[PDB]
Amino acid sequence: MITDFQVYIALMAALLASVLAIRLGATLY
Amino acid sequence: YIHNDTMRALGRPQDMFSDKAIQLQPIFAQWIQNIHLLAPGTTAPNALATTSYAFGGDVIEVGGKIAMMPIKLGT
Amino acid sequence: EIGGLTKCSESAAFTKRLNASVKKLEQRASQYEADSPPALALKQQVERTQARFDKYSRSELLCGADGLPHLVADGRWSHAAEFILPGFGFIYISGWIGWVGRKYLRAVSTSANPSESEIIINVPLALKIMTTGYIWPISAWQELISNDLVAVSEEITVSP
Amino acid sequence: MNDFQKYLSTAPVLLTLWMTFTAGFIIEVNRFFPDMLGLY
Amino acid sequence: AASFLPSILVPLVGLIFPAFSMALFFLYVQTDD
Amino acid sequence: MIDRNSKVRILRKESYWFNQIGTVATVDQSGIRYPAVVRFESVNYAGTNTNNFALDELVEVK
Amino acid sequence: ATKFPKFSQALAQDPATRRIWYGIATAHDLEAHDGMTEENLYQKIFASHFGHLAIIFLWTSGNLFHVAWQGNFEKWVSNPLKTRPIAHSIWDPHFGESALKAFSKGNTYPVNITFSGLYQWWYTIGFRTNQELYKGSIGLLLLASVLLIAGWLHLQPKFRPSLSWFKNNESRLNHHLSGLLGFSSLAWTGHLVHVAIPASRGVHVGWDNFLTTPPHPAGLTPFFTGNWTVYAENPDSATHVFNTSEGSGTAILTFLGGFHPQTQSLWLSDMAHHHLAIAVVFIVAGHMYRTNFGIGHNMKEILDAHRPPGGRLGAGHVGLFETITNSLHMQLGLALACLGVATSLTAQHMYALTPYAYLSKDFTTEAALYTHHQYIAGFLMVGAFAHGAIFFVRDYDPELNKNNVLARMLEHKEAIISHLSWASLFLGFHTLGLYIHNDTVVAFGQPEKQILFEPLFAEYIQAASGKAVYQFNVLLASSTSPATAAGNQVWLPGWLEAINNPKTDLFLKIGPGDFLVHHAIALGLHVTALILVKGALDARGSKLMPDKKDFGYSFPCDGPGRGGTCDISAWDAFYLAMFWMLNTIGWVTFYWHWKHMTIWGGNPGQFDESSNYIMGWLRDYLWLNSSPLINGYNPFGMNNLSVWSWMFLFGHLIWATGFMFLISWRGYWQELIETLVWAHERTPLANLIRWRDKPVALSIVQARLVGLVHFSVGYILTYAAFVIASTSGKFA
Amino acid sequence: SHTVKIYDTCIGCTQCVRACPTDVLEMVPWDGCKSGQIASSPRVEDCVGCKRCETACPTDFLSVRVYLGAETTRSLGLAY
Numbered sequence A: 001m002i003t004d005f006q007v008y009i010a011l012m013a014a015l016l017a018s019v020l021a022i023r024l025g026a027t028l029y
Numbered sequence B: 001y002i003h004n005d006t007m008r009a010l011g012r013p014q015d016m017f018s019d020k021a022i023q024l025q026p027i028f029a030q031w032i033q034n035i036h037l038l039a040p041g042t043t044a045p046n047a048l049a050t051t052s053y054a055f056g057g058d059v060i061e062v063g064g065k066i067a068m069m070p071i072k073l074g075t
Numbered sequence C: 001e002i003g004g005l006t007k008c009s010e011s012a013a014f015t016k017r018l019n020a021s022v023k024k025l026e027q028r029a030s031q032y033e034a035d036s037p038p039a040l041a042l043k044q045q046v047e048r049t050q051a052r053f054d055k056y057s058r059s060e061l062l063c064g065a066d067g068l069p070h071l072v073a074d075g076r077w078s079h080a081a082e083f084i085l086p087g088f089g090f091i092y093i094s095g096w097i098g099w100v101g102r103k104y105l106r107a108v109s110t111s112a113n114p115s116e117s118e119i120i121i122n123v124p125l126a127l128k129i130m131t132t133g134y135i136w137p138i139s140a141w142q143e144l145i146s147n148d149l150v151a152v153s154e155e156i157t158v159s160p
Numbered sequence D: 001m002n003d004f005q006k007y008l009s010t011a012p013v014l015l016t017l018w019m020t021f022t023a024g025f026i027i028e029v030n031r032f033f034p035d036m037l038g039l040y
Numbered sequence E: 001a002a003s004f005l006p007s008i009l010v011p012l013v014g015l016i017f018p019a020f021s022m023a024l025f026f027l028y029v030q031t032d033d
Numbered sequence F: 001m002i003d004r005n006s007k008v009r010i011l012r013k014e015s016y017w018f019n020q021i022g023t024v025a026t027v028d029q030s031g032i033r034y035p036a037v038v039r040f041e042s043v044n045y046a047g048t049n050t051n052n053f054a055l056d057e058l059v060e061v062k
Numbered sequence G: 001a002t003k004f005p006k007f008s009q010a011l012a013q014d015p016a017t018r019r020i021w022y023g024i025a026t027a028h029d030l031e032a033h034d035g036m037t038e039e040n041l042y043q044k045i046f047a048s049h050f051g052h053l054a055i056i057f058l059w060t061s062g063n064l065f066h067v068a069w070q071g072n073f074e075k076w077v078s079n080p081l082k083t084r085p086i087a088h089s090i091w092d093p094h095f096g097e098s099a100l101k102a103f104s105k106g107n108t109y110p111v112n113i114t115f116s117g118l119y120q121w122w123y124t125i126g127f128r129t130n131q132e133l134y135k136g137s138i139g140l141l142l143l144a145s146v147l148l149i150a151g152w153l154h155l156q157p158k159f160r161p162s163l164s165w166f167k168n169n170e171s172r173l174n175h176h177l178s179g180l181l182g183f184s185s186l187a188w189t190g191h192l193v194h195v196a197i198p199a200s201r202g203v204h205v206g207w208d209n210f211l212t213t214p215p216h217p218a219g220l221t222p223f224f225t226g227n228w229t230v231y232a233e234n235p236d237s238a239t240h241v242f243n244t245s246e247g248s249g250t251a252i253l254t255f256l257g258g259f260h261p262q263t264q265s266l267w268l269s270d271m272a273h274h275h276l277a278i279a280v281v282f283i284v285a286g287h288m289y290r291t292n293f294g295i296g297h298n299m300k301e302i303l304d305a306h307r308p309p310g311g312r313l314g315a316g317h318v319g320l321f322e323t324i325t326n327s328l329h330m331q332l333g334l335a336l337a338c339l340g341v342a343t344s345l346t347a348q349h350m351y352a353l354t355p356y357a358y359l360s361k362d363f364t365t366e367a368a369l370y371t372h373h374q375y376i377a378g379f380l381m382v383g384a385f386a387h388g389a390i391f392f393v394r395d396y397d398p399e400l401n402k403n404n405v406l407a408r409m410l411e412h413k414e415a416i417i418s419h420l421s422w423a424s425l426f427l428g429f430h431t432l433g434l435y436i437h438n439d440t441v442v443a444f445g446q447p448e449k450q451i452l453f454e455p456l457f458a459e460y461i462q463a464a465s466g467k468a469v470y471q472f473n474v475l476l477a478s479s480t481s482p483a484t485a486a487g488n489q490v491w492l493p494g495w496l497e498a499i500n501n502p503k504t505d506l507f508l509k510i511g512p513g514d515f516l517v518h519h520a521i522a523l524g525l526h527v528t529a530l531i532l533v534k535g536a537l538d539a540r541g542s543k544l545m546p547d548k549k550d551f552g553y554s555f556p557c558d559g560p561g562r563g564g565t566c567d568i569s570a571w572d573a574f575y576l577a578m579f580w581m582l583n584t585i586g587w588v589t590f591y592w593h594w595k596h597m598t599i600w601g602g603n604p605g606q607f608d609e610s611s612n613y614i615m616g617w618l619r620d621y622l623w624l625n626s627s628p629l630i631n632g633y634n635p636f637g638m639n640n641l642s643v644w645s646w647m648f649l650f651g652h653l654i655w656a657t658g659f660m661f662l663i664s665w666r667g668y669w670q671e672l673i674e675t676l677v678w679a680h681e682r683t684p685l686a687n688l689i690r691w692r693d694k695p696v697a698l699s700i701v702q703a704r705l706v707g708l709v710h711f712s713v714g715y716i717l718t719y720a721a722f723v724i725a726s727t728s729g730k731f732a
Numbered sequence H: 001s002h003t004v005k006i007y008d009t010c011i012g013c014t015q016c017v018r019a020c021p022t023d024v025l026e027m028v029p030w031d032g033c034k035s036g037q038i039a040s041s042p043r044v045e046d047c048v049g050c051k052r053c054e055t056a057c058p059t060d061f062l063s064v065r066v067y068l069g070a071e072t073t074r075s076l077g078l079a080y
C-alpha cells in the first residue's frame, strides 16, 4: 500500500518538474 | 431544463424545478381557466356550457374514447 | 457448395419462408369473405408469392442459412445469370446513350446557334442520331484507332 | 403549330415525356415479367 | 494523512489555479510593453 | 501571323482561354504593350469574350 | 511587437479582439513569425519536442500512480475475470448521496472503472504488486525532469545544434533504425525473457534477484555454442494455468503459433522471439548509410540514379533529395501518413491477435481501444494530406523539380481528380442503390427479393490461411497443398486451431452483409481522398484563381466576383474533408461494434440478416442498444451510467451548436454586435467601464474552425458514451 | 493596411476607380495603353478589402489585385 511518505515523495518530485517546466517555457519564449 | 438534468443525474432530485420540488406554477393561466369555466351562467348568462372542456368540465367520451377533457397546467 | 451455401431448392429455411408468407395473406383473407373484392385480391397475391418462390427454386440460386438467395459474382459462368449476363445489358444500353449523346452534341456544335440547340432539341436530328447507336461498340473502336476520339493536349489546363 | 412544336421541343418538356415513357415501359415489363433477380 | 489530499487539492486545482491563470493572461494581453 | 481575322492559340497561362483558339480582331501599331485584340466564342468566369494579348502570347493556327 | 502577439506586428497593431484570437492560433507556426531564421527555427522545434516527450511521460506516470494509490490491481491480479478494474477515485462536491452510493458500487468509495486496458498490459508484462507500479511512476517523473533540462540546455548559446547537424540524414536514420528501433527491441526481448515469462510461470524476478536468477536453466551456453534449439524445448503445456507453475515449461523462444489456451492471448515466448528477430533486422538495416566511416550509401545518389530507361516516369526522382531536406512540411506529411497507417494496423491486428491476457473477455475495453485508435488514425491521415498541401504552397520549387516524378503528378492533376471522382460516383450510386432496394423489398414484405452478394474474394483469402467453413479447398485449407506440408510441423498446428475456432476473432466469418459495408467504407476513403488530393494539387492555382499561391494556404475567399469564390483556399479542403473523415470512421466503428455486439450476445444472426438494409442498423443497433444509456438517470433514480448518459446529451449540444457557426456567416453577426456597442456606451452606470479591445465579430476562417471543432468534439463525445454505456450496460 | 497593386495589363477603363467605396484608386497619365491612362492606389490606408474593384476589371486576369493584410480601424470598417 502506497504509504503517505511515498505519496509525499512523489509530490516533491512533481514540484521539481514544474519549476523546470516554467524555465523551459520561458526559454522558448 | 439543463439544471434539472444535472440535478437528476447527480442524484439530487429534490433540487429540481418540478411540481415535487422547487415549483414554477403558471398562476396567471390557471386563473384565466377558472374564469372561463365559471363564465357560463355568469359573465355569459345565456350560455349553457363552457366554450371548451379544456378550461374545465366533464370528460366527453365517444365510442369508449376520450374526445375532450379538462387540460391542466403545471410546472 | 460455393461458400458453404445450399441450393434454395434444398433449403428448409427457404420453404419455411414460403409457407409463412402465404399463411399471413390467407389469415387476412379469412376476415373478408367469398368473392368479396378484397378476398379475391389477396387470393391472387398468394398465387404470385407461390410462383416467385417456385421460380427461385427451379433456378440455380444458392441460399444461405437465413433461407434468402445469395448472388455469386466471381466470374464463374455457372452463375452468369446473376451478374455477367445482366451486366452486358447495362453496358450495351449505357454505351448507346452516351455515344448518341456525344454524337448529337458534336453535331449541333457547328450550327448557327450551338447553345439554342441544347435547350431546344432538334427532335428530327436527335431521333436519327439516337437510332445509330446500336453499333456503338464498333463505331467507338473505329474512332479510337483513327485518332478522332481522344484529344491531344490542345485543351485548356490549370495555371500550374 | 410550328411554335407549339418548338415549345414541346424544349428540354424540360422532352425530359418529362421521355422519362414518363421510360418509366412506363419499365413498369409494364415488371407487370408481365415480375419478381426477377436474375435472368432466371 | 494522504487520504485528505483529494479534498485539499481539488478545490485548488479547479478553482484557485484556473482563476489566477486567466487573470495573468488578461494582464499579459492587455499590457503594452 | 497575327493579323485581322487570323486565328491564333493563346499562350498566356493565366488566361481562361489558354491552349484555345481565338480570332484576332485588330492589332494596334502604336507601340502599346499588348497590341492584339482577340475574340473568343466562350465567356470567362466573369462573362467577357475578349482580351488583349501580345504577339508572343499568340501562335497562329492553320 | 509590444502587444500580445510579440511574433507579429501586424496582429499586435490590431485595434480589435482579433489580436487575441489570432495570436493564440498562430503561436506554433514558427516559420511565419517575424524575424525567423532557419537555424533558430530548427533549434526551437528541437526544444519543443523535448517538452512534448516530457508531457507524454508525465501522463504515463499519472496512470501508474493513480492505479497504484486508488486502484484494485492486486485484487484484479488474483481474480482477473471477476473484478472490474479501477482507474481513479472521484471527489465531486456536487454529488448527491445517491450518486456516492451508485458510483461506489462494488467498492467502498466512489470510483471510475477503466476501459483503457492498462491492467491487462501490465499483468502481461510482469507487474504483480502496487509497489512495483509506484516505482515506475517515480522513475518516469524523474525522466520527465531530465527531458525538460535538455530542452533548456540545447537552447543555451554553447549547446544550440547547428543547422548542418539538423540535416545529416544518414547518421540520424542509421542511429534511429539501429538504435531507437533495433536495440530497443533487443532490450524488450530481454525484459520478456528475464521478467515477464518467469512471472507467467509463477517466479518473481525483480531488481532484487535478476542478477542471480538465470532466465533459462541451460544458461547462455547454448547461445554461444550455437545450439539455439535448446531455448525452444519444453514449451508450456496446454494445461498451464497462467501466473502459476502448474503445467509450466522452460522454453523462452518459440514459434508455437496461436493463443494460450487459458488466457486466450498470444504466447509470451513467441512475442520474445518476435522482438528478437525484428531486432536483428533493424540493426542490420541501420548500417546502410555513410556516416564518417567510409562505407555506406549516399541517399542523393540513390534517388538520382533511379530513372526508368523507358522515360515513362520522366526524369525520375532527381531533385527530390533537396526538396525533402529543405522542407519540414513534406517530412511531417510523410511521417503522419505512415503513423496513420500504423495506428489503423494496431487497431485491426490487436482485436484479432489478442496480445494481452484476458483482454478478449473484457468487451467494453476491447471496443474502446478499437474506436480510439481508428479515430486517431483518421486525424493523422488528414493531417498528412494537409501538410502536403502546405508544402506545395510554401516549399515547392518548380525549377528544381523539373520533369521530376513530383512535377509530373501536378501535370496530370485533372486526370487523377477526375478518375477519383468517377470511382466515388460509381461506389456511391450502387452501394446506396442496393441498400435502398433491399430496404424497399423488405418493407413491402418480400425479403426473398433482396440483392445480396457473397463476399467470395475475402472468403477465399480466409480459406487460404486455413479457414474451412467456406469449403474452398485451397492452400492451407488443403491437406495436399505444398504450403500445408511446409508449416505443418512448424507453426500451422497452433494457427489452424485458432483460425478454425468459432470463439475467436481470428478471421471472423463473413457474409453478404459484410460485403455492402465494406463497399461503403471504400466510398468514404475515396471521397475523403478526393477532397484532400484536390486541395493539394489545386493549392498553387486553379482556373478560377490562377494566382492562389500568392495568397497562401488559408485565406477567406477571393471576393463575390468571377461567380463567387467561397471556400477556394486549400485550408478549406481540410475543413471539408474533416467531415467526411468522421463519417467514414463512424461507419467503420459502427460496423465493428454491431458485429461484435451480436457475437457477444450469442445471436450472430441478427447482424447477418438485418445488416443488409438501413432500417436494421437504426432499429436493431442504434435504437435497441441505446436503452441502457438513456436510462442512466430516470424519474425513478440513477445508476453508475449516469455520467455516460449525461455526456451523450452533452455531445449532441456541442454538435448542434457547431451548426450555428457553419451555416450562419459573419455579416449578420457583425451588424448585431454594433448595436450592442451602442447600448453599452449609452447605458448609464455601465458607461463607467469600457473595453480596451474593440468588440468585433469572428472572422470567416475562424468561424469555420470553431464550427468544425464543435462538430468534432460533439461527434466523438456522443459515440464515446454510447460505445461504453451500451457495451457495459448489457454485458458488464 | 491592405495592399493593392496594378499590373501592365490595365486598359484605363476607369471602372475600378468608379467602384471603390472609399476613394483609394485614381487614374494617372500613362503611355502603355491606347487610352493613355493607368490606375494607381495612392490611398491604400482607406481600403476596406471589398474587392469591388477586382469585380469591375475587364482584363482576362485582374489587372488590379487586392491582397488583404494588416487590419486597422479603417480597414475593419468600424464606425465605433
Ligand code: CLA
Pocket (backbone or CB within 6 Å): C097, C098, C099, C100, C101, C102, C104, C121, C126, C129, C130, G418, G419, G421, G422, G425
Ligand atoms: C451523354 C452525355 C455524357 C457523356 C458521354 C459523358 C461522359 C463522361 N462523363 Mg459526364 N456528365 C454528363 C453527360 C455526359 N458525360 C452530364 C449531363 C453531367 C452532369 C450531371 C455529367 C457529369 C459528370 C461528372 C460529375 C463526372 C462525369 C464523368 C464522365 C466520364 C466517365 C463516365 C461516367 O461516369 O459518366 C457518368 C455520367 C453522369 C453521372 C451523368 C448522368 C448521365 C447523363 C445525364 C446522361 C445524358 C444523356 C443526354 C441527356 C442525352 C441527350 C442527347 C440526345 C438528345 C441524343 C465520361 C468522359 C466522370 C469523369 O470525369 O470520369 C473520368 C465524373 O466524375 N460526368
Ligand code: CLA
Pocket (backbone or CB within 6 Å): A007, A010, A011, A014, E005, E006, E007, E009, E010, E013, G055, G058, G059, G061, G062, G063, G065, G088, G089, G090, G091
Ligand atoms: C497528467 C497526468 C495526471 C492527470 C490528468 C491527473 C488527474 C487527477 N489527479 Mg493526479 N497525479 C499525477 C498525474 C495526473 N493526475 C501525478 C504524476 C501525481 C504524483 C505527484 C499525482 C498525484 C495526485 C494526488 C495526490 C491527487 C491527484 C488527484 C487528481 C484528480 C483531481 C485533479 C487534482 O487535484 O490534481 C492534483 C494533482 C497534483 C497536485 C499532482 C501534480 C500535478 C501533475 C503532475 C500535473 C501533470 C502535468 C501535466 C502533463 C500538464 C498537462 C498540461 C496540458 C493540459 C497542456 C484528477 C483525476 C486528486 C484526487 O485523487 O482526487 C480525487 C489527488 O488528491 N493526483
Ligand code: CLA
Pocket (backbone or CB within 6 Å): E010, E011, E013, E014, E015, E016, E019, E020, G093, G094
Ligand atoms: C473543481 C472545481 C469546483 C469545486 C471544488 C466546486 C465546489 C462547489 N460548488 Mg461549484 N462549479 C464549478 C466548479 C467547482 N465547484 C464549475 C466549473 C461550475 C460552473 C458550471 C460550478 C457551478 C456551481 C453552482 C451553480 C453552484 C456550485 C456550488 C458549489 C458548492 C457546493 C457544495 C456546498 O457545500 O455548497 C454550499 C456552499 C458552501 C458551504 C460555501 C463554501 C465556501 C465558499 C465556496 C468559499 C469560496 C471562496 C473562494 C476562495 C473565492 C474564490 C477566489 C478566487 C480568487 C478563485 C461547492 C463549494 C453551489 C454553491 O452553493 O456554491 C457556493 C452552487 O450553487 N457550483
Ligand code: CLA
Pocket (backbone or CB within 6 Å): G046, G049, G050, G053, G165, G166, G168, G171, G172, G175, G176, G178, G179, G180, G181, G184, G341, G342, G345
Ligand atoms: C542511437 C542513438 C539515438 C537514439 C536512441 C535517438 C532517439 C531519438 N531521437 Mg535522435 N538522433 C541521433 C541518435 C539517436 N536518437 C543522432 C545521431 C542524431 C543526429 C544526426 C539525432 C537527431 C535527432 C533529431 C534532430 C531529433 C531526434 C529525436 C529523437 C527522439 C524521437 C522521438 C521519440 O521518442 O520517439 C521514439 C518512438 C518510438 C520508440 C516508437 C516507434 C514506433 C514505430 C512506429 C515502430 C514501428 C515498428 C514497425 C516498423 C511497424 C511495422 C508495421 C508497418 C509496416 C506499418 C528519440 C528519443 C527527435 C526528438 O524528439 O528530439 C527531442 C528530433 O527532433 N533525433
Ligand code: CLA
Pocket (backbone or CB within 6 Å): G024, G025, G026, G027, G028, G029, G030, G332, G336, G379, G380, G382, G383, G384, G386, G390, G553, G554, G571, G574, G709, G713
Ligand atoms: C506532429 C504533428 C503535428 C505538428 C508538429 C503540426 C504542426 C503545425 N501544424 Mg498541423 N496538423 C496535424 C499535426 C501536426 N501539426 C494534424 C494531425 C492535422 C490534422 C487535423 C493538422 C492540421 C493542420 C492544419 C489544417 C494547419 C496546421 C498548421 C500547423 C502549423 C501551425 C499550428 C498552429 O498554428 O497551431 C497553433 C495552436 C493552436 C491551433 C491551438 C489548437 C487548439 C485546438 C484547435 C482546439 C483544442 C480542442 C478543444 C479545445 C478540446 C476541448 C474539448 C472539451 C470541451 C471536452 C504547425 C507547423 C497550420 C498551418 O498553417 O501551418 C502552415 C494549419 O493551417 N496543421
Ligand code: CLA
Pocket (backbone or CB within 6 Å): G421, G422, G424, G425, G426, G427, G428, G429, G430, G432, G433, G527, G530, G531, G575, G576, G577, G579, G580
Ligand atoms: C447524406 C448526406 C450526403 C450525401 C448523400 C452526399 C453525397 C455526395 N457527396 Mg457529399 N457532403 C455532405 C453530405 C452528403 N454528401 C456533407 C455534410 C459535406 C460537408 C463536408 C459534404 C462534402 C462533400 C465534398 C467535399 C464532396 C462530396 C461529394 C459527394 C458525392 C460523392 C460521389 C457519390 O457518392 O456519388 C453518388 C452520389 C449519390 C448516391 C448521392 C445522390 C443520389 C441520388 C438520389 C441519385 C440516386 C440514383 C439512383 C442510384 C438510381 C439512378 C437511376 C434513376 C435515375 C432511374 C455525392 C453526390 C464529392 C463529389 O463532388 O463527388 C465527386 C466531393 O468532392 N461531398
Ligand SMILES: CCCCCCCCCCCCCCCC(=O)OC[C@H](COP(=O)(O)OC[C@@H](O)CO)OC(=O)CCCCCCCCCCCCCCC
Pocket (backbone or CB within 6 Å): G308, G309, G310, G311, G312
Ligand atoms: C498498386 C498501385 C500502383 C502505384 C504504385 C506502383 C506503380 C505502378 C508501376 C508498376 C509496374 C509498371 C506497369 C506498367 C508500366 C510499364 O509498362 O513499364 C514497363 C516496365 C519496363 O520498362 P522500363 O522502362 O523499366 O525498361 C526500359 C527498357 O529499355 C528495358 O530495358 O516494366 C514492365 O515491363 C512491366 C511489364 C510486366 C507487367 C506484368 C503483367 C502480368 C499480368 C497483367 C496483364 C493482364 C492481362 C490480362 C489479359 C486480358
Ligand SMILES: CC(=O)O[C@H]1CC(C)(C)C(=C=C/C(C)=C/C=C\C(C)=C/C=C\C=C(C)\C=C\C=C(/C)C(=O)C[C@@]23O[C@]2(C)C[C@@H](O)CC3(C)C)[C@](C)(O)C1
Pocket (backbone or CB within 6 Å): G225, G226, G227, G228, G284
Ligand atoms: C538486404 C539484406 O538484408 O542483406 C544483409 C543480410 C545479412 C544476413 C544481415 C548480412 C549479414 C551479415 C552476415 C555475414 C550474414 C551471414 C550469416 C549469418 C546469419 C551470420 C554469419 C555467420 C554465421 C556463422 C559463421 C555461423 C556460426 C554457427 C556456428 C559456428 C555453429 O553452427 C555452431 C554449431 O555447429 C555447432 C558447433 C554444433 C552443431 O550441432 C550446432 C551448430 C551447427 C549450430 C548481409 C549479407 O551482410 C546483408
Ligand SMILES: CC1=C(/C=C/C(C)=C/C=C/C(C)=C/C=C/C=C(C)/C=C/C=C(C)/C=C/C2=C(C)CCCC2(C)C)C(C)(C)CCC1
Pocket (backbone or CB within 6 Å): G329, G330, G331, G332, G333, G334, G337, G341, G384, G385, G387, G388, G389, G391, G536
Ligand atoms: C499530399 C502529399 C503528400 C502526402 C501523400 C500521402 C499522404 C500519401 C499516402 C500514401 C499511402 C497511404 C499509401 C499506402 C500504400 C499502401 C501500400 C503500398 C500497400 C501495399 C501492400 C503490399 C505491397 C502487399 C502486402 C501483402 C503482403 C506483404 C503479402 C501478401 C498479402 C499482401 C496484401 C498483404 C506528401 C506529404 C508526400 C507531399 C506530396 C503531396
Ligand SMILES: CC1=C(C/C=C(\C)CCC[C@H](C)CCC[C@H](C)CCCC(C)C)C(=O)c2ccccc2C1=O
Pocket (backbone or CB within 6 Å): E025, E026, E029, G020, G660, G661, G664, G665, G666, G667, G669, G696, G697, G698, G699, G700, G703
Ligand atoms: C455567434 C457568432 C459570432 C459572435 C460570437 C462571439 C462574439 C463569441 C463571444 C464569446 C466568446 C466565448 C469569447 C468571450 C471571451 C470572454 C469575454 C473572456 C475573454 C478573456 C480574454 C483574455 C481572452 C461571430 O462573431 C461569428 C462570426 C462569423 C460567423 C458566425 C459567427 C457567430 O455565429
Ligand code: SF4
Pocket (backbone or CB within 6 Å): G556, G557, G558, G559, G560, G561, G564, G565, G566, G567, G700
Ligand atoms: S467569402 Fe464573402 S466575398 Fe468571398 S465569395 Fe464568399 S460571400 Fe463573396
